Amino acid sequence: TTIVGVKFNNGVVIAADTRSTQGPIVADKNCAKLHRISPKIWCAGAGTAADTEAVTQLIGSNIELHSLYTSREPRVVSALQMLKQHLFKYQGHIGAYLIVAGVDPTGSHLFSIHAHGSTDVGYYLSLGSGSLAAMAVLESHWKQDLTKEEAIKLASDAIQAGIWNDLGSGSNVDVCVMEIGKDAEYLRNYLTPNVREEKQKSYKFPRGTTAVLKESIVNICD
Amino acid sequence: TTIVGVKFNNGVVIAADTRSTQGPIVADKNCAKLHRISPKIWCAGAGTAADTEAVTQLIGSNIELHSLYTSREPRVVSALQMLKQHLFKYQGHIGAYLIVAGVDPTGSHLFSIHAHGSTDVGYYLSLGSGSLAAMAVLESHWKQDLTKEEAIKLASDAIQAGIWNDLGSGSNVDVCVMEIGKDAEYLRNYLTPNVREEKQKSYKFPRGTTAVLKESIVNICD
Amino acid sequence: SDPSSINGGIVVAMTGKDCVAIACDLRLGSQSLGVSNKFEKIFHYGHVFLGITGLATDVTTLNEMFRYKTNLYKLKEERAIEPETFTQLVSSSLYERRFGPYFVGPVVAGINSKSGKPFIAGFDLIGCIDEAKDFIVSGTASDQLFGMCESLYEPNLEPEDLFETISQALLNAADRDALSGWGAVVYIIKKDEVVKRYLKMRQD
Amino acid sequence: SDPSSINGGIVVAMTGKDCVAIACDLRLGSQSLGVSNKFEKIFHYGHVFLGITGLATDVTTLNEMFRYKTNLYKLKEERAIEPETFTQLVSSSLYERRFGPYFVGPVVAGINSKSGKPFIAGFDLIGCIDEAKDFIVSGTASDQLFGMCESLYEPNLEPEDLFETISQALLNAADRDALSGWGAVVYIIKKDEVVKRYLKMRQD
Amino acid sequence: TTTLAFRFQGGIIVAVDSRATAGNWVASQTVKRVIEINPFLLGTMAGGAADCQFWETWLGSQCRLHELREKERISVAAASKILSNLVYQYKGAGLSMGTMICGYTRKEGPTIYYVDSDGTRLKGDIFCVGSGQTFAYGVLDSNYKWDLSVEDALYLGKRSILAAAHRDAYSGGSVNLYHVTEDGWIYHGNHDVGELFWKVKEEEGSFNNVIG
Amino acid sequence: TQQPIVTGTSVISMKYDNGVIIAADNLGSYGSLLRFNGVERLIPVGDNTVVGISGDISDMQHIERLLKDLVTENAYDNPLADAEEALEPSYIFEYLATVMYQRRSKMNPLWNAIIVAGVQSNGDQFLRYVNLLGVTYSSPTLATGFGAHMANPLLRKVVDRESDIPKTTVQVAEEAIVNAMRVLYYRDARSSRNFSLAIIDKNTGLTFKKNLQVENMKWDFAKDIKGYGTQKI
Amino acid sequence: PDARVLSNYLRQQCNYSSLVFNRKLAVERAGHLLCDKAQKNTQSYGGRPYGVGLLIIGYDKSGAHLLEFQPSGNVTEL
């Protein structure tokens, strides 16, 4: 868990590593903290895994139902009002902290909701195990108005500061760029700094090493 | 437990009820919270019974040993330095709060030491279960300079306010007056407001009511 | 669980015209289980009597501690210790152990061979003293006794009437106390002659 | 005491060139006491396989819950459910019970009858999904497996070599796990033909 | 852990497993659960891995001083006493150890003394301590006979530890055997429980509910 | 056991081609209260070492005393007391670590995190941590409190490995460490705005900078934030 | 024997100065130390003074070093 988000001139960008923990052992070596609420509305989820991926799921589905019925593109504060209204109802027993970002026919937006339903806004946000790492890489190299490439370069250079200095985060970087009057771009692996070197021996066994007791061919249909 | 002390022109006076508790049951119906440290130095003890009567005991004995050796009458601040030095050593595990009063060849004195070794001074003090009772009868009827009879009348009229309004104190009043250039007067029962009315029946049984199984005459000496 | 109620028992003392009376039950048991009905709580050193309640193992130890002590006294002063001189002792004694007390409630009672005056006194575990001209009670049925004594007591009873009053108090409290009973014994102490008696009571 | 370690057990899945393998031990015991060595953790609905670990009573219930569910599916859509369409299910399913979860660790694995591509997936008790192109492990000897798989795994093994690699991983972790063993069984799933095999292992 | 020892015509038979475990993982399958106090005495190892190993090795030094002084073999009773005494001194401190001190002197014959950190010191003929003690006791109780041959006395101890090994999750590995005689103990090897099972099932018929 | 009352926060530091740096503001918190400022947490020792202390102040004040006396003592019957035989960083630190441990091992610790920076008499750089548990470790960069979470990261984008110290200009080292001190003050309610940075160059010697502050900040972009999602004004 | 005791006290002093501070004990210091120890035995009743002289050598941060100690506590550097 190590996510960030930063908006520029015509849109906003968020990035997240891809490493699920579970104690000190690694579970997923290539996860995906970036979810889609609606075409141009995306979330970054830190904390309790199942919860964030299940909550975005929900809200998304409902907003899809909303726009259809109202015949207008999904605003971003809706997706926000929904999430934090739900998060609250459960006094924080649904540990999903996240960064919601997107663009509606009224500009570009960026928010950060905590577990209990509290929400805040700024131009750049960090949530996760290495939030303090990627927040020294943001309180240093930040300036108002940043090219698309600059914003992208900064966000992905924050995540990286998380990967290396934090144990609760690593592997690759994932990015999603939302630009006004334009479609959204999903960059599954805008980077791949970690790639296990090759082994020192081939560990394939010669056929017949393992001892068998019974064998047979099971059926399937009817 | 309900004691007070007040000094006047040529001395000081302290009074205390005479009722030991032990839960809601009464133990001693005529106790004696007033102890002698030295001829003209007396204490009033509230709180844990055995403790106060055993500590005054000690200090007294030592001061007697002190004067003898130094060939001078016992100062009152000595008796104080002693007590609170000892009380402290035991971080309050010897629950004895009290009012030390007396007169030495340097005037009349009045002090109040708490369990932990803390000591304070004033012209009138109250310690015990009914300290707030007898402290409304002191913060009302008090004036600088009071005749001997006035001081005595006030102190004994404070204790009384304790007897009646408090459950942890009652029965009679006990007083001791220390006057300069004069001996001390011990008034065991300067008052006796409570005296059980007479019963309604004589409860003496006729000889032979109780059933006996054996009888005999036991010996003593050799 | 209170250490002073595992074993149980009661003791009471009274004063009369030139005499005193000291009485107690007989039961010693563990919790509910009754173990003995011959466990006496009243001992004596010379013409001084002491009854003790509370934790049995301490009751026994104290008796031995005082026997021991009084014998040494007699030998050294060439005379038996007196009731007051004794009370002061068992008080200091109990106190020297202020932070690991014996779990008891003693009760002294005797007649002063010089003055000739009756004496009875009580103490709590750390040794606080307590004289009284009428009565002393201590034990599990402590309250039932204060209720009986504060009714049946009468100043200056004759030794023959004292025996009746004291017995009745003991007898009846022990009946409303679940951990006291199985018999009793009462003493009537005069300047001279001491009469001891066992009473008949419910055995439940 | 962790509910997910009373009964014990392990499950592992791997992908190869046009095939998958799913394997598990056989032991079911209470704490230290071994109770059975014929307790299988791998079931199947049509051409979709699911292995489940954790609290035995839940493992059983889930199988029944999914059999039930898949039969109703087939009947309604006039076709057997696919591996992905199924994963999504057991995920939602597990989640509808987010505040009183079944104590398990499922693992789906099959071949898609349309595309023809191999599939393996894992989930934790509340239903978080997890695809991987190489392997899935779950159970008490969970770590011992990650250690074996992160060594012996090799992309695109031939079904005959996959059987050897997967077996060896299972076999060896179960030996360093005190609550897993008493036999094993491995499956090699192709588009058609499915071969099942039991292995010989220490019985301690 | 499953350790055991017993008396019989041939003397004493000692048998143990070798599994050591941390939580639910097998940190090791190569533990020497038999402390060779000295040429004539053996102690087993239950309870605490170190407490057993440490003090029993200490105990050996003690026996040596005693023998040099008296110019005579120390008796199993006196040795077992020394141990339990030292143990009793630390009662409360948190030691931990169930153990069988086994010896066979001239005067007292073959003697087993169970001793633990509680301060208990028992004399006996059959003892089993461990998490598999209950299972070992089974095979053992039903088959023990004072007149067991030596060959069979060893096989009994072996089959016993095996029974545990199979059922008790915290027991297994390889069985280690010793035979104690009036001249000292003899090691009878280390047999891997893995291999021994299949062997017994096959040559004894037992262990039917196991397919293999 | 015990609990710390008055407390100093982080103490960041790093190495370069000719030496090492070490900073640490001057605030001494008393819980949520900021009851102090004239607090110095950089205790130089001799003319080649400096010790940045964090944690309980009463215990910091205690060590300092110990250090002074360690000095006033090395002289006692030693004429080279300022040349050949004069306290090195490694001597000081070894001694300190000893005490620290000895202490936790008596269940009566000193609630502190410590950094001993300096340059050996033969010119080598010395940077080593040591907290109330006795745990110690070396590294290019070091920091207490948040330093470990917020400083470190930045001071690593500079010297990522042991093969970069040689190419780190005394100037670049500092310009970072201070931007770091900007960050520390940006997100850490227990920090002060003005500090004290001390350098220890093998050529120039010891430079003890005092009372400075953090300039070059960005709060303008605040005017733009309004409410938390809905508020438009 | 006396030498044993002395040389031994010395081995100790060096070890302390090594573990605690991690600095090799200077030779001059070893003199003071051997003098102050030999000291005590010339000022109290009941005992006797060490009967043994020693020539110490070493190499600290001041290069070579030689000393000569006598039972009176007089260590001189030659």
Added chain:
Amino acid sequence: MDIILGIRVQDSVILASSKAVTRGISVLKDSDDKTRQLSPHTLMSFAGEAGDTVQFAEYIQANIQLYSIREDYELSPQAVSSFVRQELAKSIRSRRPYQVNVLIGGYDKKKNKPELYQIDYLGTKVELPYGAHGYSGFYTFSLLDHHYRPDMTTEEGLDLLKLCVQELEKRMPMDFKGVIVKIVDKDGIRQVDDFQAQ
């Protein structure tokens, strides 16, 4: 806990179940039957928490019997144990769960095979050749691992089971006051009132 043993042989199942009943300090009874016949060829022993124990047993028995007159057909061992595991399964996640462990041993007149299912209060079911609940296993399981054979006669099983009890007596701290044995087969249930009358 109580004693619950069971073993399947050639053509029948045998159930052993201690007879004592203890409330705290005393033993209110030494002739209790922990059994309860669900149908002509299905028998079920139990042991667990004081009240929960037979309230549950009877409940199960009532359902099976109802089903049996309704269908006029007899439910099979396999399906009977399945139903039980279902209930207990729901039980574990309810305001208050029954704490009952059981053994079901019936004769499947359809396959002409005896079957024995062992189920614990959590809903954990398993088919075994022999089983036991609670601490009962540690003292026996090894003896049965040793001598049991599927070809065994009813006559041989008893002899075996006798050994297990003798062991339970020698090493178990509790005095279970003996056991009561019962046999299920093609002809139904009968009680071996001669392991007691011995």
Added chain:
Amino acid sequence: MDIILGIRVQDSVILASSKAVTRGISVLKDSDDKTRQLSPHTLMSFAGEAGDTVQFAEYIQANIQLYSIREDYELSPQAVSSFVRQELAKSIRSRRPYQVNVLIGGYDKKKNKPELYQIDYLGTKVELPYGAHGYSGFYTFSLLDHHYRPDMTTEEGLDLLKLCVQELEKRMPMDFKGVIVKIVDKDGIRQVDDFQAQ
């Protein structure tokens, strides 16, 4: 807890003491002797905490024996029990107290009378006609209140004591594995190895 019975009759004392020894789940022995002879005519049974139990017994025994050769005279039951209560008495207020309960039954060759003293770990001593420690009393005390008579023969006592045991068996949850009896009198101590051989 363990079983400790004792009864004084016409001219002797009898002591009963369960034989089992249990460590947790198993029974490491069913032939333990909780007795320990202090002198030719004084016997003392015990029961309590695992280690404390016999360390103490032996200690006491050592003191008595020492005293006996030294004085060449034998200490009396009364004085022996007094010594014990003294130790245990000091024990209760020490860093760690022995948790041991005991029964002392000797023959006072001086009065020609058997005497039985019962003492618990707290230092509580009492002389009784019959006694027991722990839970052992609730099951017996009534039977003895009923039949006991001081004129009883040694021969009659045993018969009585047999009844108490039979009751202990019928209503006590623990299986104490029988008892071992011993008799003390003018001729010393002997073991009724026929209450066991019966």
Added chain:
Amino acid sequence: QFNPYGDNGGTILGIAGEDFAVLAGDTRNITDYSINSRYEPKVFDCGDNIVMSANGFAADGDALVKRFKNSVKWYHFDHNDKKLSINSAARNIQHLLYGKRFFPYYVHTIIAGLDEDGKGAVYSFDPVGSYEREQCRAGGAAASLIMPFLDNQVNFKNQYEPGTNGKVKKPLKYLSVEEVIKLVRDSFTSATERHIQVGDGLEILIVTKDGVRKEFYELKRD
């Protein structure tokens, strides 16, 4: 409440070859979810051809080792610079460890070297003194991920001779220091993939009858 213990991650490993022995251990040092140094050795030569490493709570480790090394020093001082037989060493370490039986060193220590016949030799230790002569032992944070592997590889477990069914166990031959280090390296990389407390670097010390050799290899800085 002051808690005197801490876990600084780490993993060490010791294999005993036919006539040499190795002992490796990564260099990363941690605290909770952070990094304290990517290179901090935990494997030292203690003299007399003996390598040692104590892993667990950093400080207790340094202490034991220092305490052990100062002990080798005195073994020489008292027995004529005699060499310390590695067996004699383990026995000694026991006493050191058991010395603190009631305030234990919170660490798993391992020594390795050569016996008095030239054969390799390893020794694993309890955190309170229980030692056994092991021939291959992983201890540390990820030991549970490397032991299953060596079991299989170094000891050929669960491997049989093809075409003989479960009848012939594959025979064990002994690995050349070369092969062992290839084994050791693969084990540590895998571990870094799946365990967040392992990474950064791997330092290895090889003991042979010529002295001690050291080799290093960089690991991923996840």
